[PDB]
Amino acid sequence: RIERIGAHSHIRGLGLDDALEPRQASQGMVGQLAARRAAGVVLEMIREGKIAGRAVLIAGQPGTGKTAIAMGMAQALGPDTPFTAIAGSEIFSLEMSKTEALTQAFRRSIGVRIKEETEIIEGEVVEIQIDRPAKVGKLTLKTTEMETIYDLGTKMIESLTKDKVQAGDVITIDKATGKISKLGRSFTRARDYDAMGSQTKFVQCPDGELQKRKEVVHTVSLHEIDVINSRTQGFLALFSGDTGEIKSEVREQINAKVAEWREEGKAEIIPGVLFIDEVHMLDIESFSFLNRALESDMAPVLIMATNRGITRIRGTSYQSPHGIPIDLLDRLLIVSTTPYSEKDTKQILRIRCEEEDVEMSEDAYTVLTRIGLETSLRYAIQLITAASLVCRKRKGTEVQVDDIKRVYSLFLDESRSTQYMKEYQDA
Amino acid sequence: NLRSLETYEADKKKQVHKKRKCPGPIITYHSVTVPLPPARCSRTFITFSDDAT
Numbered sequence: 001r002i003e004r005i006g007a008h009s010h011i012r013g014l015g016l017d018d019a020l021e022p023r024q025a026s027q028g029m030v031g032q033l034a035a036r037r038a039a040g041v042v043l044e045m046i047r048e049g050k051i052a053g054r055a056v057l058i059a060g061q062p063g064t065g066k067t068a069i070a071m072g073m074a075q076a077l078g079p080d081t082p083f084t085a086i087a088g089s090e091i092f093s094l095e096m097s098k099t100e101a102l103t104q105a106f107r108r109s110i111g112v113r114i115k116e117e118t119e120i121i122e123g124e125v126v127e128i129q130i131d132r133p134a135k136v137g138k139l140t141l142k143t144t145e146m147e148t149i150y151d152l153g154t155k156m157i158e159s160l161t162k163d164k165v166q167a168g169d170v171i172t173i174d175k176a177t178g179k180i181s182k183l184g185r186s187f188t189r190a191r192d193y194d195a196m197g198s199q200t201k202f203v204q205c206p207d208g209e210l211q212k213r214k215e216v217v218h219t220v221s222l223h224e225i226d227v228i229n230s231r232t233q234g235f236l237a238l239f240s241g242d243t244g245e246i247k248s249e250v251r252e253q254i255n256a257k258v259a260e261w262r263e264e265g266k267a268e269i270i271p272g273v274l275f276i277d278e279v280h281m282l283d284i285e286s287f288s289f290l291n292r293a294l295e296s297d298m299a300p301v302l303i304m305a306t307n308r309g310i311t312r313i314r315g316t317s318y319q320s321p322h323g324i325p326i327d328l329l330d331r332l333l334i335v336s337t338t339p340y341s342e343k344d345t346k347q348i349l350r351i352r353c354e355e356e357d358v359e360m361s362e363d364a365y366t367v368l369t370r371i372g373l374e375t376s377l378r379y380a381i382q383l384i385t386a387a388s389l390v391c392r393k394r395k396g397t398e399v400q401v402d403d404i405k406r407v408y409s410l411f412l413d414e415s416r417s418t419q420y421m422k423e424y425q426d427a
Numbered sequence: 428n429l430r431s432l433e434t435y436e437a438d439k440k441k442q443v444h445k446k447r448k449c450p451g452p453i454i455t456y457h458s459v460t461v462p463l464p465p466a467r468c469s470r471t472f473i474t475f476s477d478d479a480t
């Protein structure tokens with residue numbers, strides 16, 4: 001519950017209507033109807049997943065809400081669909097090539113819902129009488145509507161001895177493997193032992209004696225390749241990034257078995273999204289790889305964001321729009337974000353204030369909207385926070401003009417920093 | 428009696444056989460629910476066959 005509000009916490013989805021009509025202000029967003037409708041339609045395409053290898057480029061001036069609309073789409077997509085957010089400079093690893101990192105990122109945003117039929121027996125253990133030779137045992141499971149006694153085997157008795165199960169424990173035994181899983185207790189333990197005090201759990205299902213076809217959908221991403229590349233996979237799946245596995249017999253074989261599962265009804269493919277923020281940092285080799293990697297059937301939807309116009313492509317000398325080669329730039333379609341006006345800026349500032357739980361006068365809102373239209377929006381939020389803190393220190397109830405104007409001089413913007421920078425501190 | 432014989436064409440006997448096969452010093456861990464749905468609690472018992480154990 002203790003998680004602080006970040007720069008994109010004010011947004012909590014992409015405000016859209018039944019007909020995908022964008023709204024002025026909803027779900028923490030304001031203005032920018034065109035790019036928001038583009039986000040809505042690409043999100044509909046993602047949730048459809050019928051087509052693979054689609055790319056979208058979010059372009060615009062800084063502070064136009066590129067990362068904002070990206071996080072909004074991520075939120076609107078909701079759980080059950082992977083959304084791999086990554087920065088352009090994260091692919092540069094000292095233990096795995098750029099192409100390998102891109103393959104990892106692509107396969108990481110693809111999920112397979114594996115269906116598994118289970119048969120679990122549950123109930124209340126009324127009698128767990130076990131005859132230890134130092135071989136024979138019987139279990140008396142009880143439910144709210146029926147009871148049954150089961151003769152325990154040697155291995156089952158040993159498993160029960162492993163996980164201590166006293167009378168009155170709510171357990172869920174899997175008839176397939178016999179794994180002992182304790183859920184709780186139905187009553188106290190004799191009220192006499194001067195220890196082991198806990199709370200009592202609710203009774204089990206009436207038909208819990210034998211659940212026939214308990215369906216559990218195990219969801220896992222296509223990053224499962226780490227499970228095969230090495231005999232010990234937890235080390236690679238948890239921390240180790242040195243996963244330069246062999247592409248042959250791993251990628252192709254896993255894809256083939258995933259197709260077999262999809263055809264045989266075991267699992268279903270759920271393509272996610274790969275959001276590369278500041279994609280301009282990718283080397284030209286990474287762009288050349290994305291050009292071809294984006295053509296596979298397992299290719300997720302590649303959302304990208306650029307904050308530049310004509311700029312040199314990293315790893316070469318010639319320039320291209322958005323710092324992306326002409327090929328990949330032409331392949332994808334671009335979503336331009338128009339700057340926000342004064343009203344939109346004021347509304348965004350008000351939404352941020354509401355998020356931060358801070359209140360300020362109308363004149364404060366006006367002067368702060370002015371300052372934000374002049375300097376920037378993020379700087380306006382910084383001033384919101386600073387003025388709220390100055391007001392709290394001042395013992396006031398709401399932020400007045402005298403606090404925003406004070407923190408404006410206390411904290412400087414880059415435009416004024418460079419102005420006072422004429423002291424030639426260093427070069 | 429004839430009908431009983433013809434229809435006989437027991438698990439308790441197999442349990443008694445298992446007991447026979449037991450060397451004799453068998454310790455049994457036994458816990459049952461006992462009263463203080465109705466209020467109740469769990470009680471634990473550990474039966475020792477012979478004094479050796």
Ligand SMILES: Nc1ncnc2c1ncn2[C@@H]1O[C@H](COP(=O)(O)OP(=O)(O)O)[C@@H](O)[C@H]1O
Nearest residue numbers: 007029030062063064065066067068348377378
């Ligand atoms: N539509 C918007 N609604 C609310 N805040 C926005 C919006 N657009 C930009 N911002 C704010 O501007 C700052 C930077 O803009 P951002 O959302 O990152 O877009 P960009 O990626 O173009 O900078 C962030 O602090 C963000 O909160």
